[PDB]
Each structure stands twice: as C-alpha cells, then as structure tokens.
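User: Predict structure, ligand magnesium ion.
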Amino acid sequence: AMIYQKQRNQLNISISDDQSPSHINTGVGFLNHMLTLFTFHSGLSLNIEAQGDDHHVTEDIGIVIGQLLLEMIKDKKHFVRYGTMYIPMDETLARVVVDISGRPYLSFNASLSKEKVGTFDTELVEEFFRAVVINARLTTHIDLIRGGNTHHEIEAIFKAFSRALGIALTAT
Amino acid sequence: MIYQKQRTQLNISISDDQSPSHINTGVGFLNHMLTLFTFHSGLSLNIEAQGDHHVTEDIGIVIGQLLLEMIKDKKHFVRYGTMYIPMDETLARVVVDISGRPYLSFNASLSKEKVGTFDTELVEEFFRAVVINARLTTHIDLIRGGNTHHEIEAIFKAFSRALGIALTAT
Amino acid sequence: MIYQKQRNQLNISISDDQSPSHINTGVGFLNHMLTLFTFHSGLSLNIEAQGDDHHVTEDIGIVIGQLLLEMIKDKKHFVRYGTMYIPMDETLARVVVDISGRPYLSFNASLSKEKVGTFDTELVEEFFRAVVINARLTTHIDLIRGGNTHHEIEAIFKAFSRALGIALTAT
Amino acid sequence: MIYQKQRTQLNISISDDQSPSHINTGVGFLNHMLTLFTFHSGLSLNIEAQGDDHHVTEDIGIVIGQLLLEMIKDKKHFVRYGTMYIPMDETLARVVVDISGRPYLSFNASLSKEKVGTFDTELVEEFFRAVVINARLTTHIDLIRGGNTHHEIEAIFKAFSRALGIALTAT
Amino acid sequence: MIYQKQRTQLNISISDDQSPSHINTGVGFLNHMLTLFTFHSGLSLNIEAQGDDHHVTEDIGIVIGQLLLEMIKDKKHFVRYGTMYIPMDETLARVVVDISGRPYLSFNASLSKEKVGTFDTELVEEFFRAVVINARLTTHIDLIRGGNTHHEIEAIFKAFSRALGIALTAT
Amino acid sequence: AMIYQKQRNQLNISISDDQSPSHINTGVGFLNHMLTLFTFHSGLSLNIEAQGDDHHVTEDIGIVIGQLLLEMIKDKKHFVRYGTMYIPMDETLARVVVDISGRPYLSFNASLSKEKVGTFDTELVEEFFRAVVINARLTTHIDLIRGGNTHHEIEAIFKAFSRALGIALTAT
Ligand SMILES: [Mg+2]
Ligand SMILES: [Mg+2]
Ligand SMILES: [Mg+2]
Ligand SMILES: [Mg+2]
Ligand SMILES: [Mg+2]
Ligand SMILES: [Mg+2]
Ligand SMILES: [Mg+2]
Ligand SMILES: [Mg+2]
Ligand SMILES: [Mg+2]
Ligand SMILES: [Mg+2]
Ligand SMILES: [Mg+2]
Ligand SMILES: [Mg+2]
Ligand SMILES: [Mg+2]
Ligand SMILES: [Mg+2]
Ligand SMILES: [Mg+2]
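Assistant: Predicted complex:
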C-alpha cells in the first residue's frame, strides 16, 4: 500500500488506498460523520488530526485531501477514470459524476433545505467539495435530483461522491 | 404486557399500563415531546440513550417496532382514530388507521428551522420512522400554524391521542 | 327489524342485526363496495338483482335510501350526527352525515380515473345521491386528498358507512 | 434457496437461481410484466392465483416484497445499490434501488393513458409500493420521458428488475 | 472479425480488436470525433474518403451503422444495455444505448454555437441519426448541461462510444 | 406478380402488388378493418394469419409489413417515389406524405381525440406506423390537419398513408 501524508499549519492528515482503520478527529462533529462515510464508500483510509472556525477547518481539510488525492492519482497510471453514482436517502436522490481528468472543475447543483444541520453551517458542504475537487484536479458534477431533509441531502451527496470516486480510482 | 428491545446504546420499553415513564433520549426537546406522547396515548415509555438525527430516527424506529409487537398481540381494537388539537394559533389534525399498510402523508410546513437547538426537519423523520415501522397509515395535517413550538406540540398531541383511540380494545 | 321491498327484478332487505349479507347486484365493483357498507355500517344487506350499470346502481341506491328511511322512522332516540375520516394510502376522505329529514348531498370529490375495471366512476356520485336523498339525510362527502381511484372510492364508502352507523346508534 | 408462501387463493415462490418461471396471476398484462421481472432480475418466480385487478395486483406485490425480504435477510454481503436506465423507443426510465432496510418509494411517472388494454394503469404505482415497502427497499422510479403507455410501464419494470438484480449480487 | 465496405469514394472497416485506426474523412473535426469513438468504444475504425461536409458525415454514419449491424448479428450473447455520463468542464452528457433491433434515436441537445471551426454543428445529430438507425439501436442522447460547443459534442461522442462499447461486451 | 412472405414466431404474412383477395386475421377487430382499408387504398394484397397484447400484435404486424415492403421496394427499380394524399372524413382532414427514400424516418403529428376506439388503444396507431415506416425505410410525414371523431381520425390517416404509398410505388 501507498500512504500519502501531509501536515499543514494545525492539521495532520494521511490517506491510503488500503483497508486500515480510519481515525477522524476534525473537531467538527458533523464533518467527522461525513468523512467516516467517505472512507467507507471510497475504500480509502483517512487519518485526520486537527488542532485549533468550522469554515477554515472544513476548507483546510478539503484542500489537503484534494492535494493528497492528486499525489495518489499521479502514482497510479491505469485506472477506470470515470465514475457515476446515484444514491437515494429516503426522499432525497443525488447523482455524482467524477472524471479523474486533470482538469480541475466542479459543477455543484444542490439547494440544501436548511441553513444548519445541528450546529454545522450547511454552506460548508459546497466549500468542502470545491476544495477537494479542485486540488485533486477532478472534473466533478454534483446534482441533487430531489431533496427534502438536509441531513439526507448532504449524506446522499457524500455517499455518491465517495462511491463515484472509488469507482474512478479502480485500477485497470 | 411490556414490549422492549435494545438498538451508542438505546434501551426502550413500551406498555399499555399506567406505570411511570422515564424518558432520557439525550435530546431535550425530544424528551418533552415523548413525555406528551406518553400522556396522550396512555402508553408508558421508558427510554435510555447513551452515546440529533440518528438518535431521533433510532428512537422512532424502535418505538414503531415495539408498537407493532403490541398491535400483533391485540385481537379486537377500534383501529381508526382522528384527533384535532388547537394550540393557540395552530390547529392540527392527525388521522391514524392501524391497517398494516405502512404509509405516512405528512403535510405540515413548520414555521422555523429550529426550536431551541432542535432541527424541526427531525419531526417528519421521527413520524415516518414510527408510522412505517408500526405499519400504520397516518395523515398528519397542519391546518394552520404560526408558532413552531405550537405546531410541533399540536402534531404530537394529535398523533398520540389518535393512536390511543385506535388502540382501544373492543 | 327487517325492512324490505322490490323494485321491478330487484329485491332488497336491510336490518340492524348481525345477520349475514348476500349481495348480488350483477355489478362486481358495486358488490365489493356494498360489502364494505354492510361491514362498516353494522347493517346487514341482502340484494337480488335479475335481468345499464347506471340504472342498476341508481335503483339499488334509491331502494336502500327508502329502506333506511323506514328504519329511521321506527327509531326514537339516535345519535343523529356522524363524522368519519378514512385514510386509504395516499387518499383521505371525510364524510359527515346528519339524519336531519332534510334531503341534501354535497359531493366534493374529483375521482382520478373514468373507470375502475369496467365500472364507470361517475356512478359513485349517482349512488350516493340516490341513497342520501331518498333516506332524507344531509351528507357532505369530501375527498381531502386522492391519487388512486379505487382508494378514493373505498375511502368514501367506508367513511360514509361508518358515519351513518354512528348516526344511527340508539340513544 | 427457495422462498415461498400462500394467502382468494394466492401461491407464490421466488428463487435466485435459473429454475423456470410459471406466472398465472389472472391478469394478462401483469403476467407479461412479471415475466419481464423474472428475466431482468434473474429471480425465478412462480405464481398461481385462483378466485379486483387492484386486489390481485397489490396482494402479489405484498407477497413478492415479503419474500424478497426473506431472501435479503439470508444474504450476507451484497452490492446493495443498483441503478438502471432503460429506453423503450420514445420512453426513457431510470430506477434507483437501495437495499437499505428503510422502506421508501418515490414514484415519479405520469403515465400517458388510463388503460393498457383492460389493465388500469394506476395499478403500476400500487404494485411498486407493495413490493418496495414490504421488501424494505428505498427506491426512486423516474420516467425521464414517455409517450406510449405500454412502453412507459415496460421500461419501468425492466429498470426496476435490473436495478434490483444488480443490488442483490453477492459480494 | 473485420467488417468492411465501400460506398467520391468511401472505404470503411471496423473491428473489435486492438488494431490501430486510420481515419481520413476529409473533415478535420470529424477525424477528431471518430478517433475518440475508436478509443472509447474499443472498436478499430479505418476510413478512406476521397473526392458537402453534410454528405460525407451522413455517408460515414450510415456505413458505420450498417457495419455495426453486421458485427451485432455475429455476436450471440452481449450486455445489450449501456449508459454513460461524461463531464467536460461545464458540460455533462448522458447517453443510453440499447442494442434492441428497434431503430430509434432520441436526440436532446441544444448545442451552443452554429459552428465549431468550419464544422456545422447541426451535423452532429445527422451523424448519430445515421449510425443509430442503421445499426438498429435505440439510443437517447441528453445534454444535461452545456456551455462550450466543443465540450458539448466531445462529451456526447465520448458517452455514446462508451455506452456502445459496454453494450457490445460479450457475456 | 411478386409475392413476399414472412413467418415470424405467431404471424404468417404475405403481401403482393397484384389484385388478389386479401384475408386479414390479426385477432384485433379494429386492426382488421384498418388493414382492409390499407389493402384497398394501396392496391396491395395482404394475407395475415396471427395466432396467440394488442400492442405486441399490432407492432409485430407493422414490423413484418415494413420488412416485406422493403423487399418489394428493393425489387422495383423505377417508381414514382413521392406520394402525397389528403383525405377528409367528415370533420377530420389528414395529410400523409411518403418518400420511398431509403432513409427510415417518421414524423407523426396527430393528437387523437379519445384513448380508445371500442376496445382498441388509440396509442397503437403511432406504434403501427412507426413499425411500418422504419422497417420499410420510408420517410413519412403524417399530419392531422383537423379532427374531432377518433374513428374518423385514424381512418383518414390509414386511407391517406395507403394512397400516398400506392402513388409512390407506381412503376415508372
Ligand atoms: Mg475550475
Ligand atoms: Mg434519516
Ligand atoms: Mg447520517
Ligand atoms: Mg410545549
Ligand atoms: Mg340517473
Ligand atoms: Mg390498495
Ligand atoms: Mg377495495
Ligand atoms: Mg400500447
Ligand atoms: Mg412497442
Ligand atoms: Mg411489452
Ligand atoms: Mg441528411
Ligand atoms: Mg477537450
Ligand atoms: Mg477536444
Ligand atoms: Mg428514424
Ligand atoms: Mg371505418
């Protein structure tokens, strides 16, 4: 296995395409749950240690994950490249399309139903995906086909992106 | 008869006696609402959670499953219940049919995104979890609203009373 | 007490006991709806028709209406007012009946399809007017929400049947 | 492994193997759609009904759903998620299936005609809710474009069946 | 197997192996698009055109279609259904193909500009119509979002090619 | 005379450009009447024996007729090629334009007034014409200029198509 690792200053993050346990400590509860979902659905192991508001943390974590993904992508030579996933979450349906293209581009098309989920600013979801996709040099389209519950909306998007990414990273 | 199960840690029992209810979900607003449910349904609830959306949904799923155990044991019951509840400006109607056809029609646009720290979008999630897992057909209608706490309380009181009516032995 | 008559071939009896019902209208869908009526109203119905769906549905409703009226006239103290809401998956119906002696139907239900099987759905309002007017009831039928026509009609039959049985209850 | 039950008289079995399918629902159109289901899901279905279309259609859906749940409960690792697009000339349908344990159907398809032959087109949604809710699946059915009602329903049945088949694939 | 024919002079062959492709249509933009087709479908194309863009584009599409039909007729068991989403910066396209034997194209893409370079953009639909009808496929082409015309028609070519390659996969 | 014949399995169909009696047994009453009209107005003799819902039957009959027409067209070398017919049916007026072009294409522009005529699903009319036109490799435009009665609408369309086809098949 390859492990890609980065310290940015206060974050310490590693990612790996093996099946080791993930340890996610962002200091943001909702972000913890979402990145735990990312690890399971992408097949990638994340270890995050953050020290220190939610905006800087979420964005800086997204930037580092994107940068480490690019390192991972650079070292792979032959992969599926294209991944599409539909995920339903009760009333919600999301579609995410990723192309490991080297052309950094995000089309984010999801009007989330509430301004917060618990204490988490829902506007941070697009900021996270922008940071990851652009720094990983992916072309990604995120579409909320229908929604209703904001937790479901965000979760479907995280599940679909992770799975689509996983599919695209599959060795050829 | 006591129906119970476990499902973080969640321990819940429900019973149609008048034993005291102990409700500790870890969510203040949900405690108050489920306290209302016990009173208006006549069902005793005991809930122990140690560990908001996952908690709320988990509790609703377990309540619904336990309700189905209870219903399966009952032979002869009223089956149909309707209740209107006013809360100042608010008026809600809930209609329940213990039909064995799991179906929720939830028609209530709540006035605010939160009450205290509680996400109001959780109300629909709780009711869907209960109704579907209890195999009820339930229509919840907010005829008029205004104050979000009143809207939610009216819906809880109406559902609970309508359920209590439908569960009544014949 | 049994109330009965013929309308000529049509022969129908109604009773407020728990005796069995035999319903042979020659219209399958109507058979199923009248079976719902007997169960939810608490009344026993026996119908023998012999010998188009319009005439048969309407004739049955008129005779049922007239027989209900006989039964009402014999009763002294009854509840008089009945309301029932019935949900049927997507559908919610409300029916309000008043045994007032003032024959009046307010029928507010746009049914989703022109037929269920071979049965013309326009016959549902025709059945209810025949019953309500001839029994001298005041009734309001409201489809609060709908979607499936079989569900819409069944909800209405159930709600009306139960609201009538409530209203007919001895006092 | 074979999954089996009876409920009118209804007798149904399902199996994730290649045994032959005998489908006799009493409803010609539903016979055809269930034949598509077997071929496209890879699940063998045997159905014998003896004993309106509404009750038959819904009762079959409920049992198929209950038997799918038996099958799912035995399976350990499976793909879980399935999506299928099926074109039928002018029609395009998409069906997304999640074997989630959370019973939920989003049915988004405005069918072009009230009937295909003698079959009430509103029965299609009733069938899918019966299966999906009782199998504890989350499914979204979407008619992306349509035109001809037989094509619309056929595309939906093919897409759902294929998506279920994908989701059930052992890991 | 190599499928070839000639139809100004046009000579084309197509093969389901990894032989290099030589594409000389006399239309620069079409050369690039067909090179994308070769790579994404896995099919080797060889084209010699000797001798307006309309006639060449349409004739090439017809011959490719007819040769694909020859290939399909030779194959026994194949996947049959393929769907591909392809993003191209701002653009997202979806193509659904079904090797059905029912020739049908649903082309749903309003392209942003009348020309890319000297190439008439209205020729893209004409190309796909020629291919899809003559290969006897049912395909739906959908531009979900666009912006840049080069990106729009590259996304469409990529998605069709992949969807076809998937559908052509032996089972 | 040439006779073109096909068995597809349960249909047995022959078509001929002579003037022999037609025997049409599709198992669909309304389709029987329409194909009887086709035979008279096109000048082509049809013999159909079908064994066995209406959708599959109508479509399969349309497909075979289209395929046999193509065989017939292939063997003719010199014909008028272009045919246009207007047919009035009381309130209804239809126009059908056919080009024996070899480019399979149907433009069907007729909103029929009712969902059924007797027991026949009126949506089958377009399915029939699509099957015939595409498999015969005709370019055909069908236009209901005005309508009112669905039986008249379908009949005018069948009459006009048959006549236009007949005209186009005329030897040159
Ligand atoms: Mg960019
Ligand atoms: Mg949830
Ligand atoms: Mg979650
Ligand atoms: Mg309160
Ligand atoms: Mg009348
Ligand atoms: Mg039903
Ligand atoms: Mg019924
Ligand atoms: Mg049809
Ligand atoms: Mg067809
Ligand atoms: Mg079919
Ligand atoms: Mg052209
Ligand atoms: Mg480019
Ligand atoms: Mg390019
Ligand atoms: Mg065409
Ligand atoms: Mg005529």
